[PDB]
C-alpha cells in the first residue's frame, strides 16, 4: 500500500521541480528566468562529485 503514496508524492515533486536548472552564471533559475537560489546550496557544489 505504500507504493501508491510514494508514486503520487514523486509525481507531485517532479511536476514542481522539473523546470529548474543551473545556468551559466551559477544561479539556479526556473523556466521563467526567476532565481530560486543565487548559488546552489550556498556553495555551488555537486552532491555527485
Amino acid at each position: 500500500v505504500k507504493t501508491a503514496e510514494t508514486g503520487y508524492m514523486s509525481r507531485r515533486l517532479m511536476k514542481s521541480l522539473e523546470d529548474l536548472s543551473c545556468q551559466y552564471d551559477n544561479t539556479v533559475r526556473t523556466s521563467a528566468n526567476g532565481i530560486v537560489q543565487f548559488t546552489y546550496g550556498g556553495d555551488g557544489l555537486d552532491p555527485l562529485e
Binding site: 551559477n26 543565487f38 548559488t39 550556498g42 556553495d43 555551488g44 557544489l45
Partner: protein, 48 residues
Amino acid sequence: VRYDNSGCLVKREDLNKAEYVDQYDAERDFYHSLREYINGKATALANL
C-alpha cells in the same frame, strides 16, 4: 577581492562582518581549511 554592497573595496578592519558576505566565501573557507590541514602536518613535524 571582497566588495561591499555599494560596490567598492572593504577595509581590512571589517573583512569578517556579516553584511559583507559574498558568494566567494565557500572558496575562501576551502582555502583556509586546506592551509589549516597543511599547517597541522607541519605542526606535527615540528613537534616531533
